[PDB]
Amino acid sequence: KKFLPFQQFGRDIADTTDAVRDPQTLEILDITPCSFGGVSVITPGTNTSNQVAVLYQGVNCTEVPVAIHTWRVYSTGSNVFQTRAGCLIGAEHVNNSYECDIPIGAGICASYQTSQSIIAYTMSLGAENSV
Amino acid sequence: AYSNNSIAIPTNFTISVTTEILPVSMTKTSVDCTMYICGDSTECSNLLLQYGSFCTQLNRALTGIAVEQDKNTQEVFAQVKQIYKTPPIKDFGGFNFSQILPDPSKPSKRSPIEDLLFNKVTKFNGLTVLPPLLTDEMIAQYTSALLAGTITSGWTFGAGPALQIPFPMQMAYRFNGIGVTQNVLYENQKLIANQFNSAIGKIQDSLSSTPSALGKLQDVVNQNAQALNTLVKQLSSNFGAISSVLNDILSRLDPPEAEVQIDRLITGRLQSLQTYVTQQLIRAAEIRASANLAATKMSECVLGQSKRVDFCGKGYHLMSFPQSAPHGVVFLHVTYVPAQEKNFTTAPAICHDGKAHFPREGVFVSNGTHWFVTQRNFYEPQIITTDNTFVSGNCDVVIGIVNNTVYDPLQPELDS
Amino acid sequence: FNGLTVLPPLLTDEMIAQYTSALLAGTITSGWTFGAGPALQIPFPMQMAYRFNGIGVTQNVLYENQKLIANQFNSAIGKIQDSLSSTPSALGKLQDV
Amino acid sequence: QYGSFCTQLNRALTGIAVEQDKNTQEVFAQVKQIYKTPPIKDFGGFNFS
Amino acid sequence: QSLQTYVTQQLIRAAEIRASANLAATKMSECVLGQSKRVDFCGKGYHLM
Ligand SMILES: *[C@@H]1O[C@H](CO)[C@@H](O[C@@H]2O[C@H](CO)[C@@H](O)[C@H](O)[C@H]2NC(C)=O)[C@H](O)[C@H]1NC(C)=O
Ligand SMILES: *[C@@H]1O[C@H](CO)[C@@H](O[C@@H]2O[C@H](CO)[C@@H](O)[C@H](O)[C@H]2NC(C)=O)[C@H](O)[C@H]1NC(C)=O
Ligand SMILES: *[C@@H]1O[C@H](CO)[C@@H](O[C@@H]2O[C@H](CO)[C@@H](O)[C@H](O)[C@H]2NC(C)=O)[C@H](O)[C@H]1NC(C)=O
Ligand SMILES: *[C@@H]1O[C@H](CO)[C@@H](O[C@@H]2O[C@H](CO)[C@@H](O)[C@H](O)[C@H]2NC(C)=O)[C@H](O)[C@H]1NC(C)=O
Ligand SMILES: *[C@@H]1O[C@H](CO)[C@@H](O[C@@H]2O[C@H](CO)[C@@H](O)[C@H](O)[C@H]2NC(C)=O)[C@H](O)[C@H]1NC(C)=O
Ligand SMILES: *[C@@H]1O[C@H](CO)[C@@H](O)[C@H](O)[C@H]1NC(C)=O
Ligand SMILES: *[C@@H]1O[C@H](CO)[C@@H](O)[C@H](O)[C@H]1NC(C)=O
Ligand SMILES: *[C@@H]1O[C@H](CO)[C@@H](O)[C@H](O)[C@H]1NC(C)=O
Ligand SMILES: *[C@@H]1O[C@H](CO)[C@@H](O)[C@H](O)[C@H]1NC(C)=O
Ligand SMILES: *[C@@H]1O[C@H](CO)[C@@H](O)[C@H](O)[C@H]1NC(C)=O
């Protein structure tokens, strides 16, 4: 940004402050509030299997392991997929497409197969046909 | 000009294309309760936990709303078992669907009208927006499959296996459905195709001219956005406390009075949250009703020909085509309208040999000198024979009978 | 008197009466044609024959029982005023709101 | 000090007020013209008085 | 609090009236301007007009 010489902070969103003048020196720094979001547990029937997956809704994966203060995640614990819905832990990625067994979001659906027991794929709208 | 023996019969027709716009889904949002009420403070939560499971209630309501939005979209669009595709050949006997079929040239697979609609339609306090399950490409493929099935199989693909049929024959099917014989289309195919293409061009131009017609969708977005903004504004009020900022009052005053200040703030913010949740619930109910109406229209207007008056566009209904839009569906209804009417004299029956002849399908019309039988929506006179009429009764019971001669096609053959 | 007002409706009742009269005149003198496109005149008995063919009865029935049908229709329309006025709870739906 | 409560209350009330007129117009205004019956009531025995 | 409760009740009643008005509009479009074949939609028995 460019601040006029008489200005200190800025309110682009018009209800909160998101930019400021540097306290050390005369540059300008923007402020982005610290990330957060819901945690969802994706599981098949509990009397079918115990392996599950964890979806941090709306947050990049370069962030999950070290913020929260209980179970841990471990980078090697999965492939740590990165979806448009958020960060997904505990499931692999399969190029094939099937019906939406479990709704995750943004066209991604998860299912159970007997290599992690839970897989996530892009939903298939149906078998292709031509008349 | 009403009279007891005069009718008006059309002599020409016009094919019209109208539009209808229906919102379907509303943005899915979820608000963290504790984070909104207070940010990075333990005293807030310790004083808040006295209020019970209100947070669970709010989260349950919002989750239900989001799931209902997803169900609405899935019910409205996913109505076909397969995914058809139009053949690369573009020979339909004169009709031209270039304005509604998907365009592979564009980076995103959409029809030109879909792009016209898409280009005509226009965060840190615990509130989050969740992505929908179905992206725009999925619904685009759904609409493309529906359109291809409608074009290449008529309505048969909506009841069982898809059956191919030439487009003029489907046109004759629909014309016979509305009450007009097939020969009308099979003889005015070129005019009908020209009128259809002209109507499609006109609707494209009319939609591109002004964006007010899309207001039904646009308004909805604004409403949701407003219902968010006001909420954040509620974080800038004292609610009768010393200061609207929690950190300053917490760091300024000791527990035994900062607690009453925090209680005031918590009461105000909880009231705001309850108001927002109730408003969202009511708006979601309205949107669900609209989505159910859209699903019904898609099932009946598109997958078949509706006989309900003024349900799939003004006038006699021929078909419809669906198109997608942000949070909405746009139906293009193709309908039939009589154009030019002519006066005729009328009689309910004809007395020939002491018996009354009634028309099988059609009306008796006299041009002042002779009598003919026509259909009820297109002037097409024919000689009155024993096959167009049926005999029942005598010549003295009906009121308004007329005298004329009914021709028998068998007699000249018998003489010959 | 404490900050509440009632805003008069946009459509006055005479306008509603005119709209209903227009609809009735159209459906009397032109059948169902005025709904689709331009209105076309047609004799009322022929329109009744149209409807009879619509519900699956041939039109000779009406064209031979016209006077009886007219008498029954007149009596039925006459009875509606008595059936409405005699019972003072007929309009309960609007009174409730 | 309570923020913007009654403003949104007023907004909801005016929204309902507009919906009322919208309902009436949708229900009744389905005819583009206003037709008139002929002066003579010759309907073949039927009575519309 | 009292005003908020009254406004919410009014909103619910307005939604109900909107549903009734939509039903009335559909009935006007189909039963009046045509001859509906739906059973019991425009009164008991075969519908004439
Ligand atoms: C029925 O109406 C159509 C158009 O409403 C007529 O088609 C036009 O006819 C004129 C001359 O008759 C031509 O100059 C136009 O080019 C035609 N329009 C199109 C789109 O082709 C048609 O002639 C009318 N038919 C009858 C029997 O009157
Ligand atoms: C369907 O109509 C479109 C017009 O929208 C036709 O596209 C035109 O095609 C010609 C010749 O290829 C071009 O010179 C024009 O520039 C095109 N116009 C537009 C707007 O694309 C198309 O050819 C028609 N299809 C058929 C089969 O008649
Ligand atoms: C009413 O229709 C009849 C039937 O077509 C007309 O009689 C024919 O008129 C044409 C002239 O256009 C003559 O060539 C035919 O020879 C006539 N038919 C017979 C059997 O002679 C009649 O002219 C029409 N009347 C009016 C007023 O248009
Ligand atoms: C139709 O024609 C018949 C016979 O061609 C007409 O019957 C005549 O009716 C009058 C009045 O009662 C009698 O005086 C004649 O004797 C009848 N004719 C015969 C041959 O018996 C009948 O009136 C005609 N109807 C119309 C409407 O013109
Ligand atoms: C239609 O019915 C009305 C009654 O509802 C008839 O009006 C009556 O007409 C007679 C004379 O024929 C008067 O003695 C009565 O006083 C009238 N009654 C009322 C209530 O005004 C009317 O004549 C009928 N019209 C037709 C064409 O049948
Ligand atoms: C639960 O167990 C029963 C019997 O052990 C089995 O039939 C059922 O399939 C199991 N549940 C699921 C979801 O598989
Ligand atoms: C996190 O991933 C998203 C994926 O879209 C990317 O845009 C963003 O830059 C990433 N952030 C970091 C810090 O890598
Ligand atoms: C299959 O998946 C791998 C990732 O596991 C990816 O690199 C590859 O491009 C995919 N192939 C296809 C055809 O999608
Ligand atoms: C109406 O029909 C009559 C035939 O009964 C005809 O003479 C008259 O010219 C017609 N009116 C118009 C305006 O065409
Ligand atoms: C039609 O009305 C006229 C009045 O001008 C009358 O003379 C004639 O008998 C009537 N005809 C029928 C069939 O009702």
Nearest Cα of chain E lies from the Cα of B238 at a distance, in angstroms, of: 18
Residues 6+ positions from B407 with CB-CB distance below 8 Å: B383, B384, B385, B386
Token duo for residue B311: 């349900």
- The answer to whether D19 and E18 have CB atoms below 8 angstroms apart is yes
Q: Does B123 touch chain A (CB under 8 A)?
A: yes
Can you name the residues that pair with A105 across neighbouring β-strands?
A108
- Please state the separation of Cα B141 from the chain's center in Å: 18
The Cα-based distances of A7 to A11, B182, B219, D27 in angstroms read: 11, 77, 36, 58
Closest ligand 5 atom number to CA of residue D46 = 28
Chain E residues in contact with D23 (beta carbon < 8 A): 17-18, 21
Question: Which residue, among D5, D9, D11, D27, would best test binding to B if mutated, counting the most B CBs under 10 Å from its CB?
Answer: D5
C64 CA to centre of ligand 9 in angstroms: 29
Chain D residues in contact with C71 (beta carbon < 8 A): 45
**Is the CB of C40 less than 8 angstroms away from the CB of B10?**
yes
The Cα-based distances of B256 to B242, B248, B250, B262 in angstroms read: 15, 16, 11, 10
The Cα-based distances of B154 to B150, B157, B304 in angstroms read: 5, 7, 8
Nearest Cα of chain C lies from the Cα of D22 at a distance, in angstroms, of: 10
Q: Is B90 exposed, middle or buried (0-12, 13-18, 19+ CB in 10 A)?
A: exposed
CA angle (B51 as vertex; B46, B56 as ends), nearest 5: 100
Q: Does D46 touch chain B (CB under 8 A)?
A: no
- Whole-angstrom Cα distance, residue C21 to residue B338? 25
Residue A98 has a CB neighbour count (10 Å cut-off) of: 14
Nearest to A120 by CA among A99, A98, A91, A89: A91
Positive or negative torsion for Cα B378, B382, B387, B388: positive
Token duo for residue B256: 């035994």
> 3-class SS at A87?
strand
Residues 6+ positions from B294 with CB-CB distance below 8 Å: B22, B24, B76, B329
Residue B276 has a CB neighbour count (10 Å cut-off) of: 22
Side-chain-side CA neighbours of B367 within 13 Å: the count stands at 10
- The answer to whether B34 and B138 have CB atoms below 8 angstroms apart is no
Label the pairing between strands B363-366 and A102-105: unpaired
Residue nearest to atom 4 of ligand 7 (CA): A60
Nearest to B31 by CA among B247, B291, B232, B309: B232
Question: Which residue, among A82, A125, A128, would best test binding to B if mutated, counting the most B CBs under 10 Å from its CB?
Answer: A125
Task: For residue B167, report the phi and psi dihedrals to the nearest 5 degrees.
Answer: -60, -45
HEC secondary structure over chain B? CCCCCEEEEECCEEEEEEEEEEECCCCCEEECHHHHHCCCCHHHHHHHHHHCCHHHHHHHHHHHHHHHHHHHHHHHHCCCCCECCCCCCCCCCCCCCCCCCCECCCCCCECHHHHHHHHCCCCCCCEEECCCCCCHHHHHHHHHHHHHHHHHHCCHHHCCCCCCCCHHHHHHHHHHHHCCCHHHHHHHHHHHHHHHHHHHHHHHHHHHHCCHHHHHHHHHHHHHHHHHHHHHHHHHCCCCCCCCCHHHHHHHCCHHHHHHHHHHHHHHHHHHHHHHHHHHHHHHHHHHHHHHHHHHHHHHHHCCCCCCCCCCCCCEEEEEEEEEECCEEEEEEEEEEECCEEEEECCCCEECCCCEEEECCCEEEECCCCEEEECCCCCCCCCCECCCEEECCCCCCCCCCEECCCECCHHHHHHC
- The answer to whether B402 and B351 have CB atoms below 8 angstroms apart is yes
How many angstroms is the resolution? 3.4
Give the C:D interface size as CB pairs under 8 Å.
61
Residue type at B369 in one-letter notation: T
Nearest to D11 by CA among B231, B220, B227: B227
Nearest to D5 by CA among B86, B118, B288, B237: B237
Token duo for residue C24: 């009735």
Alpha helices by DSSP H, listed for A54-118, are: 64-67
- Whole-angstrom Cα distance, residue B306 to residue B316? 9
- Whole-angstrom Cα distance, residue B278 to residue A1? 40
- Whole-angstrom Cα distance, residue B94 to residue B80? 28
Token duo for residue B26: 């509303």
- Please state the separation of Cα B286 from the chain's center in Å: 16
- The answer to whether C30 and C42 have CB atoms below 8 angstroms apart is yes
The Cα-based distances of E12 to A1, A92, B221, C4, C93 in angstroms read: 48, 47, 22, 20, 17
Residues 6+ positions from A68 with CB-CB distance below 8 Å: none
Task: For residue B16, report the phi and psi dihedrals to the nearest 5 degrees.
Answer: -120, 150
- The answer to whether B153 and A131 have CB atoms below 8 angstroms apart is yes
The B363-366 sheet, strands edge to edge: B6-10, B341-345, B363-366, B371-374
The A108-112 sheet, strands edge to edge: A91-93, A118-122, A108-112, A102-105
Residue nearest to atom 9 of ligand 1 (CA): B191
- Please state the separation of Cα B35 from the chain's center in Å: 41
Q: Does C70 touch chain D (CB under 8 A)?
A: yes
DSSP labels for C19-84? HHHHHHHHHHHSTTHHHHSS-----HHHHHHHHHHHTT--THHHHHHHHHHHHHHHHHHHHHHHHH
Ramachandran quadrant class, A126 (left: phi over 0; alpha: psi -120 to 50; beta: rest): left
Long-range contacts of C74-80 (CB under 8 A, 24+ apart): C74/D46, C74/D47, C77/D47
- Whole-angstrom Cα distance, residue B232 to residue B123? 9
- Whole-angstrom Cα distance, residue A104 to residue C73? 63
CA angle (C87 as vertex; C86, C90 as ends), nearest 5: 135
- The answer to whether A125 and A131 have CB atoms below 8 angstroms apart is no
Residue E8 has a CB neighbour count (10 Å cut-off) of: 16
Token duo for residue C39: 């209105």
Q: Please give the torsion angle defined by the CA atoms of residues B87, B90, B95 and B96, in that order, rounded to the nearest 10 degrees.
A: 100
Residues 6+ positions from A15 with CB-CB distance below 8 Å: B229, B232, B233, B236
- Whole-angstrom Cα distance, residue B402 to residue B269? 84
> 3-class SS at A64?
helix
Nearest to C37 by CA among B10, B337, B18: B337
> 3-class SS at D32?
coil
Query: Among E8, E15, E33, whose Cβ lies nearest the Cβ of B310?
Result: E33
CA angle (B373 as vertex; B370, B375 as ends), nearest 5: 140
> 3-class SS at E6?
helix
**For chain E, counts of helices (H) and of strands (E):** 1, 0
Long-range contacts of B219-222 (CB under 8 A, 24+ apart): B220/B23, B220/B26, B220/B287, B220/B327, B221/B27, B221/B121, B221/B122, B221/B326, B221/B327
Tell me the technique behind this structure: cryo-EM
Side-chain-side CA neighbours of A2 within 13 Å: the count stands at 0
Interface of B with E in 254-293 (CB under 8 A): 275, 278, 282, 285-286, 289
Ramachandran quadrant class, B394 (left: phi over 0; alpha: psi -120 to 50; beta: rest): beta
- Whole-angstrom Cα distance, residue C10 to residue D19? 12
Nearest to B126 by CA among B61, B59, B220, B64: B59
Can you name the residues that pair with B319 across neighbouring β-strands?
B334
Residue nearest to atom 3 of ligand 6 (CA): A47
The Cα-based distances of D22 to B163, B247, B273, C11 in angstroms read: 44, 48, 30, 11
Question: Which residue, among E5, E7, E11, would best test binding to D if mutated, counting the most D CBs under 10 Å from its CB?
Answer: E7
- Whole-angstrom Cα distance, residue B363 to residue B382? 11
- Whole-angstrom Cα distance, residue B134 to residue A53? 21
Label the pairing between strands A118-122 and A91-93: parallel
Nearest to D35 by CA among C35, B13, A93, C50: C35
Chain A residues in contact with B83 (beta carbon < 8 A): 125-129
- The answer to whether D29 and B310 have CB atoms below 8 angstroms apart is no
> 3-class SS at A40?
strand
- The answer to whether B314 and B366 have CB atoms below 8 angstroms apart is no
Radius of gyration of chain C from its Cα atoms, rounded to whole angstroms: 20
Can you name the residues that pair with B329 across neighbouring β-strands?
B22, B324
Residue type at A117 in one-letter notation: S
- Whole-angstrom Cα distance, residue B168 to residue B154? 11
Residue B204 has a CB neighbour count (10 Å cut-off) of: 16
- Whole-angstrom Cα distance, residue B388 to residue B409? 11
Can you name the residues that pair with B363 across neighbouring β-strands?
B374
Nearest to B231 by CA among B283, B262, B173, B274: B274
Angle at which helices B167-178 and B182-209 cross, to 10°: 100
Nearest to B330 by CA among B16, B17, B18, B21: B21
Q: Does D10 touch chain E (CB under 8 A)?
A: no
The H-or-E segment that residue A103 falls in is strand A102-105
- The answer to whether B55 and B275 have CB atoms below 8 angstroms apart is no
Side-chain-side CA neighbours of B377 within 13 Å: the count stands at 22
Nearest to B334 by CA among B193, B158, B181: B193
The H-or-E segment that residue A57 falls in is strand A53-57
Chains that touch D (3 or more CB pairs under 8 A): B, C, E
Chain E residues in contact with D27 (beta carbon < 8 A): 21, 24-25, 28
Query: Among B282, B285, B308, whose Cβ lies nearest the Cβ of E30?
Result: B308
Nearest to B31 by CA among B273, B267, B244: B273
Token duo for residue D32: 């583009």
- The answer to whether B406 and B357 have CB atoms below 8 angstroms apart is yes
Name the residue with tokens 């009709």: B95
